[PDB]
Amino acid sequence: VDCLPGWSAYDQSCYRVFKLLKTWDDAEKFCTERPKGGHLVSIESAGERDFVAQLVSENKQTDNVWLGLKIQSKGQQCSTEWTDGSSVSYENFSEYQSKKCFVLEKNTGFRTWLNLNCGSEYAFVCKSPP
């Protein structure tokens, strides 16, 4: 409950909405780059989720927002078998057509989690201890 200027205090962590464009990968290093460390945010409970959509609404709902979640994929996609039952032995996607790193949906009201590409340009929010 004791936190930095340009930041905000909730339970278990300091929070700050970072008003810059960056990739998912680069935003992780910019989260660790804040002196008190940490990563992108993490959402588990209802009151916690309801809390965070209100902080980005103070930044006037600019666009979609990165968060810490990411699909950990073996290869490219996330399905074992085709419809005829045969196994996925071949992949022909593009890294722009990959949706691994998730994002706060700006439409639904920053209440949900949507995967997109990781090299895209969005705002982020680091989650840092006191």
């Binding site: 810059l20 593009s94 722009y96």
Partner: protein
């Protein structure tokens, strides 16, 4: 009889091509669906003449010296119209005329300018072709009265620039041709969030400067979607080529491979600690 009547099971095609005419033959089958009217001498045509044929789905009016279209009667079940290669100098209005129109090929005419309400009652138009006319500049809100639009051709004209928000509203646009024009920049925010599978933008002299940074950014992000127009070739020479779009149409200077040194980026928040 008067023409070649094709008896395929699906539709009642009739071919009256290249038979030297100046108007329609009097007695056609009533169940005619396709009618071919190419290479004739039709310098003015009245759509009302087709109104007996309640079964018509298709009509080719290409390559037959046409210069004036009497936009007159309602063609309910018409879906495709070909008017390519003729000698029109402006474009008719068809709001009430034919709702069910999906294909509209107006290529290789002599158009030069577009109206405002240039198309209405065309919520069912899927494809549209302006290939090779003499257009320079497009009217705002152009593609708005056509939402279902999948394809769209603007190749080879003397296009210079485009309205931002032109594409906006086209959730089913998949193909998009702007080759061999004289495009020079794209407005920031032009394609938006829509995925565009096919897009040909070669043959244009581009001014690579700070203003084209949105376009390069798009070309980086969409390089698997940039192709080049080829007609009689194997599909295997139909592969993705982002390098084709070139600064000042120089083969040695792509656009996505452009540094843009000196262009101001959008004071660190986390550095002032």
């Amino acid at each position: 009889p008067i023409c070649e009547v094709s008896k395929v099971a699906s539709h009642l095609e009739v071919n009256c091509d290249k038979r030297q005419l100046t108007a329609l033959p009097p007695d056609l089958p009533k169940d005619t669906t396709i009618l071919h009217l190419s290479e004739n001498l039709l310098y003015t045509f009245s759509l009302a003449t087709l109104m007996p044929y309640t079964r018509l789905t298709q009509l080719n009016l290409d390559r037959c010296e046409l210069t004036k279209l009497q936009v007159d009667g309602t063609l309910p079940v018409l879906g495709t119209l070909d008017l390519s290669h003729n000698q029109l100098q402006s474009l008719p209005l068809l709001g009430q005329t034919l709702p069910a129109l999906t294909v509209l090929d107006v290529s290789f005419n002599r158009l030069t300018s577009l109206p405002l309400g240039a198309l209405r009652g065309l919520g069912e138009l899927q494809e549209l072709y302006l290939k090779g006319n003499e257009l320079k500049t497009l009217p705002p809100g152009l593609l708005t009265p056509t939402p279902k639009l999948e394809k769209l051709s603007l190749a080879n004209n003397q296009l210079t620039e485009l309205p931002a928000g032109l594409l906006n509203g086209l959730e089913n646009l998949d193909t998009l041709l702007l080759q061999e024009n004289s495009l020079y920049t794209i407005p920031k925010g032009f394609f938006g969030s829509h995925l565009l599978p096919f897009a040909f933008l070669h043959g244009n002299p581009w001014l690579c400067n700070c203003e084209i940074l949105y376009f390069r950014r798009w070309l980086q992000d969409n390089a698997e979607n940039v192709y080049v127009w080829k007609q009689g070739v194997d599909v295997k020479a139909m592969t993705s080529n982002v390098a084709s779009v070139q600064c000042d149409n120089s083969d040695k200077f792509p656009v996505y491979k452009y540094p843009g040194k000196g262009c101001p980026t959008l004071y660190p928040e986390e550095d002032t600690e």
